C-alpha cells in the first residue's frame, strides 16, 4: 500500500490520518474529520494540561504524589512498582505518556479535576472536538458510533501542533512535553517504524477494543521543518487485533505524500 485507500483496503476497517507539513501548512488527509476513539493518545493532552497547571503553580511537577495499592487499575506497570515511594507529578506524566500507565493518568486527573478538566484544557488550546468522558480504563471501549472519548485526526494534529511547536505552553514546559513524547517506549512498531533515518520523533500511542490502533506525534527531519502526524485506526469486530504495521505504513504514506 502506497495510498491511504490501498492501506485501508488491505487492512480492513477505518483509517484516519492528518499530517501537516509545518513548512507550508499543507496537509494530507484520510477521514480526517471523522471521530475515532482516541484511547491512550489523550495522555498527550493530559500531560499538557498538567504542565499548564505547573505554570500557575510553580513546583507542581516536583510534588510527590502517593497512592495506595487499591488505586491501581488494569495496565499499571510503572505505578504498581511505586506504591511505597510515591511518584512525582513529572514522573507520573512520564509514566503515562511513555508507557501508557493507566493509574498514572487517573492520579493526574484526580489532581486537576477529572476528565472534564482535560476536556476544558483542550478547549483552552483551540480544540473544540476532543472530548474525554471517562476515567481509565473505561475510555478504551472504542464502541462504533459512541461519541465518548473521541476526537478527529485533524483536531488532534492541530492540538499537537500548537502544544509541541506553537506557544500553548511556555518554552520550559513545552520542552518538557517534547522530552516526554520523545521518550515513548511503547511505540517502536508504529510511527517510529515509518520515519527515515535521522528523523527525531515524539509521540503518544493508544490501543483499544475493536482492534483500535492509534498514534499521534511530531516528526523532526534534520534539514526540514517538522511534520505533525495523527493516525487513528479501528476495525469492525470487537475482538479485532491491533495492527501496528498499519500505523507504520500510514506514516510512510503521509511522509511520501508531503515530501
Amino acid at each position: 500500500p502506497a495510498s491511504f485507500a490501498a492501506l485501508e483496503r488491505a487492512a480492513g476497517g477505518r483509517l484516519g490520518v492528518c499530517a501537516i507539513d509545518t513548512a507550508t501548512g499543507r496537509r494530507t488527509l484520510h477521514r480526517a474529520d471523522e471521530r475515532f476513539p482516541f484511547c491512550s493518545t489523550f495522555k498527550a493532552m493530559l500531560g499538557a494540561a498538567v504542565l499548564a497547571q505547573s505554570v500557575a503553580h510553580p513546583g507542581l511537577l516536583q510534588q510527590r504524589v502517593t497512592y495506595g495499592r487499591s488505586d491501581l487499575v488494569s495496565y499499571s506497570p510503572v505505578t504498581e512498582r511505586h506504591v511505597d515511594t510515591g511518584m512525582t507529578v513529572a514522573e507520573l506524566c512520564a509514566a503515562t505518556i511513555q508507557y501508557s500507565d493507566s493509574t498514572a493518568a487517573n492520579e493526574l486527573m484526580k489532581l486537576i479535576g477529572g476528565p472534564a478538566a482535560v476536556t476544558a484544557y483542550a478547549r483552552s488550546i483551540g480544540d473544540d472536538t476532543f472530548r474525554l468522558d471517562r476515567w481509565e480504563t473505561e475510555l478504551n471501549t472504542a464502541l462504533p458510533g459512541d461519541l465518548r472519548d473521541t476526537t478527529t485526526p485533524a483536531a488532534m494534529a492541530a492540538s499537537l501542533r500548537v502544544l509541541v511547536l506553537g506557544d500553548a505552553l511556555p518554552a520550559a514546559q513545552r520542552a518538557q512535553l517534547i522530552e516526554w513524547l520523545r521518550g515513548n517506549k511503547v511505540g517502536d512498531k508504529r510511527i517510529r517504524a515509518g520515519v527515515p533515518t535521522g528523523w527525531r520523533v515524539g509521540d503518544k500511542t493508544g490501543t483499544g477494543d475493536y482492534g483500535t490502533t492509534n498514534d499521534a506525534g511530531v516528526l523532526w527531519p534534520p534539514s526540514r521543518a517538522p511534520i505533525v502526524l495523527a493516525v487513528y485506526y479501528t476495525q469492525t469486530r470487537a475482538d479485532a487485533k491491533a495492527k501496528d504495521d498499519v500505523i507504520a505504513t500510514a506514516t510512510r504514506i503521509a511522509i511520501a505524500t508531503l515530501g
Binding site: 473544540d128 472536538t129 472530548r131 461519541l147
Partner: peptide
C-alpha cells in the same frame, strides 16, 4: 460551526 462545538460538549 456552532453545532460542531455543541456536539463535542453534549452529554451522551
Amino acid at each position: 460551526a456552532a453545532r460542531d462545538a455543541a456536539v463535542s460538549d453534549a452529554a451522551a
